Design a binder for this molecule. Structure first.
Ligand SMILES: S=c1[nH]c2cc(Cl)ccc2o1
Length: 156
């Protein structure tokens, strides 16, 4: 656990010094009240001028003991309508799979910015949920209408 905790302390220090505006990333607490660097509560703001604008989308970031060998599991809570988000809330993204594009050097900031980019540009070769994928393919106007409604629902 020393390797993960040392890296996670480095990430926290960097994040607090400089992070993208409107984003949140904060470790949680253990039952005894001490800091739990393995479980972070995060939020991603929708990009201005997009259907996601005005929404603030809460996500949990869960680190395994072998981090940064492995990527964190990133899970929208509550789950979101998006073609590449599983119904569970888990994000499907190549940088978040050890055997795909994860690299140990990737930072929490890079992950959250990567997920923000995913929100506004789905990967249609990578569908994780049937409904959002089907609507994206069949009617982009309806898709955006649904995204706008969701953004309003999660206005901060
Ligand atoms: S408040 C509050 N709860 C929460 C949960 C997650 Cl996963 C992320 C951000 C949050 O803010």
């Amino acid at each position: 656990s020393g390797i993960a905790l040392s890296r996670l302390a480095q990430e926290r220090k960097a994040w607090r010094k400089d992070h993208p505006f409107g984003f949140v990333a904060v470790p949680t607490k253990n039952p005894d009240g001490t800091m739990n660097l393995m479980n972070w509560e995060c939020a991603i703001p929708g990009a201005a001028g997009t259907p996601w604008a005005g929404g603030l989308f809460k996500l949990r970031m869960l680190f395994k003991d072998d981090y940064p060998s492995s990527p964190p599991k990133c899970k929208f809570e509550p789950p979101l309508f998006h073609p590449n988000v599983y119904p569970s809330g888990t994000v499907c993204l190549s940088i978040l799979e050890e055997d795909k594009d994860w690299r140990p050097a990737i930072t929490i900031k890079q992950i959250l910015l990567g997920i923000q980019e995913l929100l506004n540009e789905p990967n249609i070769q990578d569908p994780a949920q049937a409904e959002a994928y089907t609507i994206y393919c069949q009617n982009r106007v309806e898709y955006e209408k649904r995204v706008r409604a969701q953004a309003k629902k999660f206005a901060p």
